[PDB]
Design a protein around this ligand. Structure first.
Ligand code: HB8
Ligand code: CA
Ligand code: CA
Ligand code: ZN
Ligand code: ZN
Length: 225
């Protein structure tokens, strides 16, 4: 039951949640989310490119036909922020970790329009995340990158680890070029603790998994110290 639109694949995960998948040209998949929140849609992560991100927005108009209120992007790398210009051109309010916005020029990304900040416990400072509906934004600590953030969807089973979390069969932690090898394991575990009842763990580079993806990721990362 996956749907294709252009270069993008969509999979419904829950009545009001879909995974978007885009490919960097041997094609490399990256996943984000689409959430229907009453009369408005919320997006987590861009596609790799502006043209792919415009395809997400066009699919949403065709299949859901509700306005896209805002997008949260989960770190300043191309798979998650490559399509910022497309979001801005479409009039979608964009939010990213302050640190992602600060790193964005140095990582070749366009900054979001708004900065999220976080408490010492990892939870977003709520005044920086106005009207986020069911999206619960959590900074787990440095791991895949220093700026990586994660998102749980309230009212559902379903938390999004972005590029921090790898699937439970993985043999590696992917691209570690910008990683914090010392703190990674703790950050993975902190994600798990933040969303303790999430049973469907969505991530950037594998299909959705169980909580096993969290504990497996942390076990791998333990060996990086
Ligand atoms: C090493 C493999 C995964 C085979 O190839 C890539 O890394 N693809 C990418 C190309 C350009 C840019 C990027 C950024 C990436 B993130 O997952 O660290 O956000 S991946 C990636
Ligand atoms: Ca661009
Ligand atoms: Ca870099
Ligand atoms: Zn990355
Ligand atoms: Zn990635």
């Amino acid at each position: 039951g996956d749907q294709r639109f252009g270069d993008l694949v969509f999979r419904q995960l829950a009545p009001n949640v879909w995974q978007h998948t885009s490919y960097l040209d041997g094609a490399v998949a990256s996943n984000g989310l689409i959430v229907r929140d009453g009369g408005r849609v919320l997006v987590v992560d861009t596609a790799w490119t502006d043209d792919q991100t415009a395809q997400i927005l066009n699919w949403i108009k065709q299949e859901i036909n509700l306005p896209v209120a805002l997008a949260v992007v989960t770190h300043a790398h191309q798979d998650k922020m490559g399509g910022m210009d497309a979001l801005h051109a479409a009039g979608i309010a964009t939010y990213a970790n302050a640190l992602s916005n600060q790193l964005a020029p140095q990582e070749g990304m366009v900054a979001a329009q708004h900065s999220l900040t976080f408490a010492a416990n990892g939870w977003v400072e709520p005044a920086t995340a106005p009207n986020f509906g069911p999206l619960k934004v959590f900074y787990p600590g440095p791991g895949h990158t220093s700026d990586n953030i994660t998102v749980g969807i309230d009212g559902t089973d379903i938390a999004f680890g972005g590029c921090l979390i790898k699937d439970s069969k993985a043999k590696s932690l992917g691209n570690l070029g910008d990683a914090d090898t010392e703190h990674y394991a703790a950050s993975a575990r902190a994600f798990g603790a933040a969303f303790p009842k999430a049973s469907m763990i969505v991530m950037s580079h594998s299909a959705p998994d169980s909580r096993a993806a969290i504990t497996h990721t942390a076990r791998m990362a333990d060996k990086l110290r």
